[PDB]
Amino acid sequence: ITRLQEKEDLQELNDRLAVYIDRVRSLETENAGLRLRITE
């Protein structure tokens, strides 16, 4: 593939990693709050 395509494919992967890593962290925070609510 072209260098533009290499860069574009990688830019998209980096964007997706950032988005999904952030979302895993926030969903883990929600999961901790829900488990705490069950214990309370």
Next chain:
Amino acid sequence: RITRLQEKEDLQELNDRLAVYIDRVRSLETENAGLRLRITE
């Protein structure tokens, strides 16, 4: 400096880790939904 084949391998590795995070997001969404339902009902 880096060949297109090495770039491809690099993207494969990054995508392999991305797949884990996507899987984790789906699992947490499902788990959280069950926990919320237990709390409310």
